[PDB]
C-alpha cells in the first residue's frame, strides 16, 4: 500500500550504485518497502547490456581526463550520461517477473510529469524511454534482480543537453535529446520535479508515498 522515498541528493555514481545495492537487498528480503531513490549523479557516462566501443566517439580516457565518471552497468539500454540537473530516480520495487509492464508504468509516471509542465510527451512505439516529439526528455533502463527492480530513469530537468554529444547511442532512436529546462526556456527547480515524480508514481503505482 505504501512505498518510501529517499532524496539522496547529489551523490557520485559509485557509491549511488553501492547504495542500490543494499536497498535492493532489504527489498528482496521483505524488509523495507519499495523504494523510491531521487537523487542526482556528477558528469557520469554509463554502458549497459546493449553497449560496445562503437557507443564512445571518444577512447574511455578522453572521458576521465574531460571530467567524466565511466562505468559498465547491468541495465537495460546501452550509452548514456547522468549530471548535474538531470533527475536521476531508481525504483527498488518487488516487480516479479512482469519487467514490461513495470518499464511502463515508469513511462506513465514521466507522462503525466511532462503533462503538468503543459507538454505533451510519449513512450513512442518504437523507442525505449519518454520523447518529446523527436527528442527524449528521459531515459528508462532496468535491471531486475530476484524479483526486485533497480537502475531506473533519468529525467532531464536541467540537464547540461551538451553533454550527450560525446556519446552515440545504437539501434531505434528519434533525433535529440531535450529537457524541461529547454522546452520551458527556463530552469525548473529540482525539488519541484522531485515532487512531481513522487505524486505521479503515487498515481500511476496506486500507492501512498511516505
Ligand atoms: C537510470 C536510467 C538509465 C537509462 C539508460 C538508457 C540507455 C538507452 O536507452 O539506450
Given at each position: 500500500m505504501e512505498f518510501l522515498v529517499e532524496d539522496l541528493g547529489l551523490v557520485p555514481y559509485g557509491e549511488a550504485w553501492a547504495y542500490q545495492k543494499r536497498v535492493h537487498r532489504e527489498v528482496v528480503a521483505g524488509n523495507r518497502p519499495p523504494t523510491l531513490l531521487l537523487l542526482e549523479h556528477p558528469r557520469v557516462i554509463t554502458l549497459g547490456r546493449?553497449?560496445?566501443?562503437?557507443?564512445?566517439?571518444?577512447?574511455?580516457s578522453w572521458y576521465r581526463e574531460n571530467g567524466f565518471e565511466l562505468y559498465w552497468v547491468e541495465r537495460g539500454g546501452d550509452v548514456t550520461y547522468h549530471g548535474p540537473g538531470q533527475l536521476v530516480g531508481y525504483?527498488?520495487?518487488?516487480?516479479?517477473?512482469?519487467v514490461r509492464r513495470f518499464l511502463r508504468q515508469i513511462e506513465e509516471a514521466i507522462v503525466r510529469v511532462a503533462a503538468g509542465y503543459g507538454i505533451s510527451a510519449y513512450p513512442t512505439p518504437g523507442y525505449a524511454g519518454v520523447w518529446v516529439g523527436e527528442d527524449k526528455l528521459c531515459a528508462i533502463g532496468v535491471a531486475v534482480k530476484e524479483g526486485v527492480s533497480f537502475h531506473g530513469f533519468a529525467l532531464?530537468?536541467?540537464?547540461?543537453?551538451?553533454?550527450?554529444?560525446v556519446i552515440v547511442p545504437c539501434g531505434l532512436k528519434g533525433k535529440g535529446v531535450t529537457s524541461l529546462e529547454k522546452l520551458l526556456g527556463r530552469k525548473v527547480p529540482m525539488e519541484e520535479a522531485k515532487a512531481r515524480v513522487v505524486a505521479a508514481f503515487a498515481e500511476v503505482f496506486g500507492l501512498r508515498p511516505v
Amino acid at each position: 500500500m505504501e512505498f518510501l522515498v529517499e532524496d539522496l541528493g547529489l551523490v557520485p555514481y559509485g557509491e549511488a550504485w553501492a547504495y542500490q545495492k543494499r536497498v535492493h537487498r532489504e527489498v528482496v528480503a521483505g524488509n523495507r518497502p519499495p523504494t523510491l531513490l531521487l537523487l542526482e549523479h556528477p558528469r557520469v557516462i554509463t554502458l549497459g547490456r546493449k553497449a560496445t566501443g562503437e557507443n564512445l566517439l571518444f577512447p574511455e580516457s578522453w572521458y576521465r581526463e574531460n571530467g567524466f565518471e565511466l562505468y559498465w552497468v547491468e541495465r537495460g539500454g546501452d550509452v548514456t550520461y547522468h549530471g548535474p540537473g538531470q533527475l536521476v530516480g531508481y525504483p527498488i520495487f518487488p516487480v516479479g517477473r512482469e519487467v514490461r509492464r513495470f518499464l511502463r508504468q515508469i513511462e506513465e509516471a514521466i507522462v503525466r510529469v511532462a503533462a503538468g509542465y503543459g507538454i505533451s510527451a510519449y513512450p513512442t512505439p518504437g523507442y525505449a524511454g519518454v520523447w518529446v516529439g523527436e527528442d527524449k526528455l528521459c531515459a528508462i533502463g532496468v535491471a531486475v534482480k530476484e524479483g526486485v527492480s533497480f537502475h531506473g530513469f533519468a529525467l532531464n530537468v536541467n540537464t547540461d543537453l551538451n553533454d550527450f554529444t560525446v556519446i552515440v547511442p545504437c539501434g531505434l532512436k528519434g533525433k535529440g535529446v531535450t529537457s524541461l529546462e529547454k522546452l520551458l526556456g527556463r530552469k525548473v527547480p529540482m525539488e519541484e520535479a522531485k515532487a512531481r515524480v513522487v505524486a505521479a508514481f503515487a498515481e500511476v503505482f496506486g500507492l501512498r508515498p511516505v
